Design an enzyme around this catalytic site. Structure first.
Site, short mmCIF file in Angstrom:
data_model
loop_
_atom_site.label_atom_id
_atom_site.label_comp_id
_atom_site.label_asym_id
_atom_site.label_seq_id
_atom_site.Cartn_x
_atom_site.Cartn_y
_atom_site.Cartn_z
N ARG B 59 11.21 -43.40 -15.18
CA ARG B 59 11.39 -42.07 -14.60
C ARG B 59 11.59 -42.16 -13.09
O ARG B 59 10.71 -42.62 -12.36
CB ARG B 59 10.20 -41.18 -14.92
CG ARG B 59 10.06 -40.82 -16.39
CD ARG B 59 10.23 -39.32 -16.60
NE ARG B 59 9.05 -38.57 -16.21
CZ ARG B 59 8.98 -37.24 -16.17
NH1 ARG B 59 10.03 -36.50 -16.47
NH2 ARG B 59 7.84 -36.65 -15.82
N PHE B 64 9.66 -36.07 -6.48
CA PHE B 64 8.25 -35.88 -6.83
C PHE B 64 7.55 -37.20 -7.12
O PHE B 64 6.38 -37.36 -6.77
CB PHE B 64 8.14 -34.89 -8.00
CG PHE B 64 7.07 -35.22 -9.01
CD1 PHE B 64 5.73 -35.15 -8.67
CD2 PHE B 64 7.41 -35.54 -10.31
CE1 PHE B 64 4.75 -35.44 -9.60
CE2 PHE B 64 6.43 -35.82 -11.25
CZ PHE B 64 5.10 -35.77 -10.89
N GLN B 67 7.68 -42.95 -10.75
CA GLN B 67 6.78 -43.61 -11.70
C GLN B 67 7.53 -44.48 -12.69
O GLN B 67 8.60 -44.12 -13.20
CB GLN B 67 5.96 -42.56 -12.45
CG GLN B 67 5.28 -43.02 -13.74
CD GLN B 67 6.14 -42.85 -14.98
OE1 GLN B 67 7.28 -42.40 -14.90
NE2 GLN B 67 5.58 -43.18 -16.14
N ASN B 106 -2.00 -40.85 -16.27
CA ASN B 106 -2.71 -40.75 -17.54
C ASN B 106 -1.92 -39.94 -18.56
O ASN B 106 -0.74 -39.65 -18.35
CB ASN B 106 -4.10 -40.13 -17.32
CG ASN B 106 -4.05 -38.63 -17.07
OD1 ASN B 106 -3.71 -37.85 -17.95
ND2 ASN B 106 -4.39 -38.23 -15.85
N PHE B 117 2.25 -44.70 -10.34
CA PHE B 117 3.28 -43.83 -9.77
C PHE B 117 3.06 -43.70 -8.26
O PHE B 117 1.95 -43.44 -7.80
CB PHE B 117 3.31 -42.46 -10.47
CG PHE B 117 2.22 -41.52 -10.05
CD1 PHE B 117 1.00 -41.52 -10.69
CD2 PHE B 117 2.45 -40.58 -9.05
CE1 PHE B 117 0.01 -40.64 -10.32
CE2 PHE B 117 1.46 -39.70 -8.67
CZ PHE B 117 0.24 -39.73 -9.31
N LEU B 126 -0.86 -31.83 -8.89
CA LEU B 126 -1.85 -32.68 -9.59
C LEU B 126 -2.91 -33.07 -8.56
O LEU B 126 -2.54 -33.69 -7.56
CB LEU B 126 -1.14 -33.92 -10.11
CG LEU B 126 0.26 -34.16 -9.55
CD1 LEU B 126 0.33 -35.48 -8.80
CD2 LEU B 126 1.29 -34.13 -10.67
N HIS B 130 -5.86 -36.74 -11.70
CA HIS B 130 -5.36 -38.10 -11.61
C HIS B 130 -6.09 -38.87 -10.51
O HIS B 130 -6.29 -38.36 -9.40
CB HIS B 130 -3.86 -38.11 -11.34
CG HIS B 130 -3.07 -37.39 -12.38
ND1 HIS B 130 -2.48 -38.03 -13.45
CD2 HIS B 130 -2.78 -36.07 -12.53
CE1 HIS B 130 -1.85 -37.14 -14.20
NE2 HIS B 130 -2.03 -35.95 -13.67
#
Ligand SMILES: *[C@@H]1O[C@H](CO)[C@@H](O)[C@H](O)[C@H]1NC(C)=O
Ligand SMILES: *[C@@H]1O[C@H](CO)[C@@H](O)[C@H](O)[C@H]1NC(C)=O
Ligand SMILES: *[C@@H]1O[C@H](CO)[C@@H](O)[C@H](O)[C@H]1NC(C)=O
Ligand SMILES: *[C@@H]1O[C@H](CO)[C@@H](O)[C@H](O)[C@H]1NC(C)=O
Ligand SMILES: [Fe+3]
Lengths: 642, 182, 11, 362
Positions: B59, B64, B67, B106, B117, B126, B130
């Site tokens: 990805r 953003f 990861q 996760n 990431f 987030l 995390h």
């Protein structure tokens, strides 16, 4: 301490996958040693420097009016200073806290004794038959439903090895081991060899209880992702943590009275010890010990007619002066006093804060139960025998199982019985029509469209002002109504509790529907996990095993597809289907006999309510208490003078 | 101001397609989250064999995250830590502060694994869900170049992002780092 | 949306 | 903004959540609307003060409870007694909170309370007052903000500009004042005007109010926290107290009255020194000695009134003073205990409990 056991377990599993027997045996032995070493270290230093610093509690003042809250401030200060000293000792003992933490499935496999299975396989591969048969016997004792281990045990017995009296158990706690052999020896009428075993069992049980009481203290338990919205003060958090700790401590009594060989914890574990022991003492002839043991048992139960007669008889053979001379034992007195105090505190907490608690002892006097709680227990007992009469009337007038456990009164007026279990071609199944109305329906749609949503979160949003309050109140009302009617219909005696509830709506996006031949939701069951071709069902922590009944309530029908269908255990043969409408509710047991599946919606909106109920008060959805508090405080409250 | 300490360093070496860019010298706190930092370190040395050697960055979203990590599969839910398959989240002590922090991806609660990431902007969406266990200390231009490749509809890079090297670099005296960015 | 999950990627 | 305020009889028309009112005020200010913003900000301030007063009333009782009738067998297990008392106090607090109207709304987040404790809305409020021909109110708000934060530049510039405006030179009033501070100001004025009886009356009025305010503000510090770790029982609940004690240690210094831009050091010490001097001026040794003893307790390092105490001891058999008259007042002892114990506990806690993983950024 050593490294964490899970790392060694993973290395051993990888080596077993590769097939390195020395590696796996070394890894399993190291992990088994490390677990015990860590547990012993924790228990040892925890108890030693919890006993190092006492709690003093010298209440040598009477707070007078002309000192203000200074006395309370000092009272708080001294106690919390002692607490800080104890915390300092604990931190200088334990070292790195991370070595004591491990995930749930690790404890699951440790309980299932899989490392012993790997060890016995490796030992057989390495020709160390003694250790192999020891581990195999330990595993078979742990799991008595494995025929392969029985076959291996028979094979090892047939060819070279050992006899029937050296099959050591390396897992069972010592206190339980003598109890079973003592009971067996008493069965063959050998009282001479019995009494030392029961005495040792008593001493080891006391020691084990002492150990269990000081190992329970651990991290607080939250519900999922509830960390962010925790807004309790100091005195509330302390009380909640202590209440949970005390409940866990009291669970040590029912934990120690369980064995894998049985599927029910042994009833009245402690009293039965004294009963057998006094019977043995009467058999041998030691009258003083017999009457002492009888008095100790009668301390627990003051109205047992049988050993009342037994004690009268023993006094008749003995002398009166010796009869009043000998009294009960002090250890039982201390245990009873402490247990009564903890039970009183727990019942007060249940009465005030509404945190559920269940008594693990059947000898608790009713004087510790608060008056408000006693009325509730009286009510459930009355309806327990009321329902028993109604069912008994049925077969006396008369495939039974589909007749005597359904067909409820349907209390709320307006409801119908359009759809019944026989028509569906299945059991424990029903679809209701008209639990709600049409004018009430669109309020829920507005509520879900404005903002899965829980009832408590909807109530909070209504309090803030984002969403209308009337819809939030109607949500709670319809939830309560559906819960009561679901309980009533299936002729359940035990009161039904709440497990989970959320209002959800499904939106069909028309851009991913191309070549979407895969089913939207696979056919499954709620309590356990379903295997397609294996055709098995296992109740494991990966799934919630406490769910019993599930009910789904529909709100709209302006969409295509999404029909609710029932499928057999093969997950292929569709049994029956229902048509979504407005006000229709589907009720079925969450057992393995009701696999359900949901198809895909072509276009439109599908909004419905998902419900689950449990028959175990221990697994009660904890967030309902705050919802009740909010409801009673927002709509019908009270105020002080100022 | 104040900040956490560092214990170990790793020298991740990326290669974009058929070209080599540089050396992203990392930085890992070793006294605030002792466990996950051991996971990453022991996993990045090729100790047991499930190494990060020859992995895939699946990805790559434009602004953003970057990861990606899995040696079992190449883009799916592939993952295998050393403590089993799932090691519990241990402490959410730090919060993502702007560009260049490293946290664990996760799949819920108590479902960690081995999927790191790197954040590219402040990402408070987030936070507390995390665990963050490291700050980068060099080579932002490398991340900037790896973040600007032509991506697809499913976020996979059109070309391949191969991690062609790793290892361990040791620091003999824990120093301190700031708490804003870079 | 903008999540970083492993298995069920969401919006 | 505080004139039509009554804790008991509060108008129910403005009973709205604090966060919503603050957001509406900010939106109106961003919308170049002044009167509505002023009204909304005043409502927000009144709501905050009402919340503080409700907390003070709720902690007035419950915490100040005697003994809820223990038993004769419970005395053998101290832990059970302590935690039962704590449970009783918690239940009483929970039952008391629901009664007050101010708790029947959505509680604000921690950051909103932190902002309000920093007196930040006063900047926008004074800007609105200046944009609405309210020069006295604007300068009063600016002075109030500068009292808590004397290190700003923009606010200093605005205050300098406002002082340059003629007429607005006598309206320097603190919008967040306290009764004891005003009583102290009048008392010092009287003492400078060589008046004694009025001075001592003002001191005996002001001291209990200051003690009460300090105790309530201490009792208002046991708030919530943000959970970020999971530890064992003792370790987990020994950090919440670390945080609340960190908050508590500034309680004494946050209530210190400030005059001339400088906090008055040793408020209680100067209090007792003034009381002792006033009592000496009226030859009331019977009441003068305890004040001197209290001052010596607060600070042993002295030469003048130590010698005064020596002189009093020398002539103890002249005015008829028993040995009981040479002890400090109980309230001073309580204050000394509650300060020294807190400082000692903080120093002990910041050696073994607090984790060591932070450092200095070079
Ligand atoms: C009964 O047992 C106790 C100890 O178990 C022993 O001291 C006593 O002598 C026994 N009674 C008789 C009559 O032997
Ligand atoms: C909910 O039920 C209660 C019954 O106690 C009733 O007083 C109330 O009006 C009901 N509200 C709604 C919205 O149905
Ligand atoms: C505290 O609450 C109790 C509740 O019974 C009340 O009697 C008492 O007067 C309250 N305290 C004060 C100072 O009013
Ligand atoms: C308060 O005063 C001092 C504190 O320095 C000490 O004697 C103790 O903490 C307290 N005194 C009494 C008599 O309790
Ligand atoms: Fe389901």
């Amino acid at each position: 301490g050593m490294v964490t056991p899970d790392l060694l377990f993973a290395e051993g599993t990888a080596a077993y996958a590769r097939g390195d027997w020395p590696g796996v045996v070394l890894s399993m032995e190291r992990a088994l040693r490390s677990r015990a070493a860590l547990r012993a270290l924790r228990l040892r230093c925890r108890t030693q420097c919890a006993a190092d610093f006492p709690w003093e509690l010298d209440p040598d003042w009477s707070p007078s009016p002309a000192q203000a809250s200074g006395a309370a401030a000092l009272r708080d200060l001294s106690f919390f200073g002692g607490l800080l000293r104890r915390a300092a000792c604990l931190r200088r003992c334990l070292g790195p806290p991370a070595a004591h933490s491990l995930s749930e499935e690790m404890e699951l496999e440790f309980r299932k004794r899989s490392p012993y299975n790997y060890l016995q396989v490796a030992y057989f591969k390495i020709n160390k038959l003694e250790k192999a048969v020891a581990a195999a016997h330990t595993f078979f004792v742990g799991n008595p439903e494995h025929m392969e281990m029985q076959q291996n045990l028979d094979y090892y017995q047939t060819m070279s090895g050992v006899k029937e009296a050296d099959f050591k158990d390396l897992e069972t706690q010592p206190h339980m081991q003598e109890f079973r052999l003592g009971v067996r020896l008493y069965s063959e009428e050998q009282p001479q060899e019995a009494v030392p075993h029961l005495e040792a069992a008593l001493q080891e049980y006391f020691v084990a209880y002492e150990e269990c009481r000081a190992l329970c203290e651990g991290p607080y338990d939250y519900d999922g992702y509830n960390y962010l919205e925790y807004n309790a003060d100091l005195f509330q958090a302390i009380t909640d943590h202590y209440i949970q700790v005390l409940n866990c401590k009291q669970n040590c009594v029912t934990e120690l009275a369980s064995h894998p060989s049985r599927e029910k914890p042994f009833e009245d574990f402690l009293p039965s010890h004294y009963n057998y022991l006094q019977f043995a003492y009467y058999n041998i002839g030691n009258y003083t010990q017999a009457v002492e043991c009888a008095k100790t048992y009668l301390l627990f139960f003051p109205n047992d007619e049988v050993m009342n007669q037994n004690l009268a008889y023993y006094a008749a053979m003995l002398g009166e002066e010796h009869t009043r001379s000998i009294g009960p034992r002090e250890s039982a007195k201390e245990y009873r006093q402490r247990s009564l105090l903890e039970k009183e505190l727990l019942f007060f907490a249940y009465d005030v804060f509404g945190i559920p608690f269940v008594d693990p002892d059947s000898w608790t006097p009713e004087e510790v139960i608060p008056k408000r709680l006693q009325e509730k227990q009286k009510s459930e007992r009355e309806t327990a025998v009321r329902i028993s009469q109604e069912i008994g009337n049925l077969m006396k007038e008369i495939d039974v199982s589909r007749l005597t456990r359904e067909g409820g009164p349907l209390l709320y007026e307006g409801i119908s019985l359009t759809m019944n279990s026989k028509l569906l071609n299945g059991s424990q199944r029903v679809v209701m029509d008209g639990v709600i109305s049409d004018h009430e329906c669109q309020e829920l749609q507005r509520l879900t469209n404005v903002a899965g949503v829980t009832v408590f979160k909807a109530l909070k949003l209504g309090q803030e002002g984002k969403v209308p309050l009337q819809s939030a109140h109607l949500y709670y009302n319809v939830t309560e109504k559906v819960r009561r009617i679901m309980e009533s219909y299936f002729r359940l005696d035990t009161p039904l509790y709440f497990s989970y509830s959320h209002l959800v709506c499904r939106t069909a996006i028309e851009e991913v529907q191309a070549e979407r031949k895969d089913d939207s939701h696979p056919v499954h069951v709620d309590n356990c996990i379903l295997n397609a071709e294996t055709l098995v069902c296992v109740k494991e922590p990966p799934a919630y095993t406490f769910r019993d009944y599930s009910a789904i309530l529909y709100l709209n029908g302006d969409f295509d597809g999404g029909n609710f269908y029932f499928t057999e255990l093969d997950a292929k043969t569709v049994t029956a289907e229902v048509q979504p409408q407005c006000g229709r509710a589907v009720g079925f047991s969450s057992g393995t006999e009701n696999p359900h599946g949901v198809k895909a919606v072509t276009r439109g909106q599908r909004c419905a309510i998902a419900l689950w109920f449990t028959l175990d008060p221990r697994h009660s959805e904890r967030d309902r208490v705050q919802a009740d508090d909010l409801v009673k405080m927002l709509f019908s409250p009270e105020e002080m003078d100022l | 101001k104040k900040g956490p300490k560092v214990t170990v360093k790793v020298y991740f070496d990326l290669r974009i397609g058929d070209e080599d860019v540089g050396r992203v010298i990392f930085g890992l706190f070793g006294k605030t989250v002792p466990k996950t930092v051991d996971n990453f370190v022991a996993l990045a040395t090729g100790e047991k064999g499930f190494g990060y050697k020859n992995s895939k960055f699946h990805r790559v979203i434009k602004d953003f995250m970057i990861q990606g990590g899995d040696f079992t599969r190449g883009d799916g839910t592939g993952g295998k830590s050393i403590y089993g398959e799932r090691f519990p989240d241990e402490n959410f002590k730090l919060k993502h502060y702007g560009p260049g922090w490293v946290s664990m991806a996760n799949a819920g609660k108590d479902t960690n694994g081995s999927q790191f990431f790197i954040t590219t902007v402040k990402t408070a969406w987030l936070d507390g869900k995390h665990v963050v266990f490291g700050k980068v200390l060099e080579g932002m231009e490398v991340v900037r170049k790896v973040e600007s490749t032509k991506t697809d509809s499913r976020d996979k890079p059109l070309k391949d992002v191969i991690i062609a090297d790793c290892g361990k670099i040791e620091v003999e005296k824990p120093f301190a780092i700031a708490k804003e960015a870079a | 949306x903008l999540l970083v999950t492993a298995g069920l990627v969401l919006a | 903004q505080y004139e039509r305020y009554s804790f008991r009889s509060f108008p129910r028309d403005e009973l709205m959540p604090l966060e919503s009112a603050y957001r509406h005020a900010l939106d109106k200010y961003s919308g170049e609307h002044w009167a509505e913003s002023v009204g909304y900000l005043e409502i927000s301030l009144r709501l905050h003060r009402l919340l503080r007063d409700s907390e003070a009333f709720c902690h007035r009782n419950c915490s100040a409870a005697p003994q809820p009738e223990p038993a004769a067998g419970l005395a053998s297990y101290p832990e059970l007694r302590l935690f039962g008392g704590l449970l009783r106090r918690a239940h009483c607090l929970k039952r008391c909170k629901q009664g007050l109207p101010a708790f029947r709304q959505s509680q604000p987040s921690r950051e909103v309370l932190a902002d309000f404790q920093r007196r930040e809305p006063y900047k926008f409020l004074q800007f609105a007052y200046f944009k609405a021909n309210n020069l006295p109110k604007a300068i009063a708000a600016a002075h109030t903000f500068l009292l808590k934060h004397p290190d700003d530049e923009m606010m200093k510039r605005n205050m300098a500009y406002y002082k340059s405006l003629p007429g607005a030179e006598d309206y320097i009033k603190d919008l967040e004042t306290k009764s004891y501070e005003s009583l102290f100001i009048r008392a010092v004025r009287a003492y400078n005007g060589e008046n004694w009886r009025t001075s001592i009356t003002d001191m005996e009025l002001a001291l209990p109010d200051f003690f009460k305010a300090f105790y309530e503000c201490l009792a208002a510090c046991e708030g919530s926290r943000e959970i970020k770790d999971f530890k064992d029982f003792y370790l987990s609940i020994a950090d919440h107290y670390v945080e609340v004690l960190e908050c508590k240690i500034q309680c004494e210094e946050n209530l210190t009255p400030v005059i001339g831009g400088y906090p008055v050091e040793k408020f209680v010490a100067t209090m007792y020194h003034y009381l002792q001097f006033a009592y000496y001026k009226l030859n009331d040794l019977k009441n003068a000695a305890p004040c001197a003893v209290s001052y010596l307790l607060f600070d042993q390092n002295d030469k003048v009134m130590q010698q005064n105490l020596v002189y009093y001891q020398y002539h103890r058999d002249t005015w008829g003073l028993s040995d009981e008259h040479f002890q400090p007042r109980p309230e001073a002892v309580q204050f000394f205990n509650v300060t020294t114990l807190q400082k000692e506990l903080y120093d002990f806690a910041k050696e073994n409990i607090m984790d060591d993983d932070e450092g200095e950024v070079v």
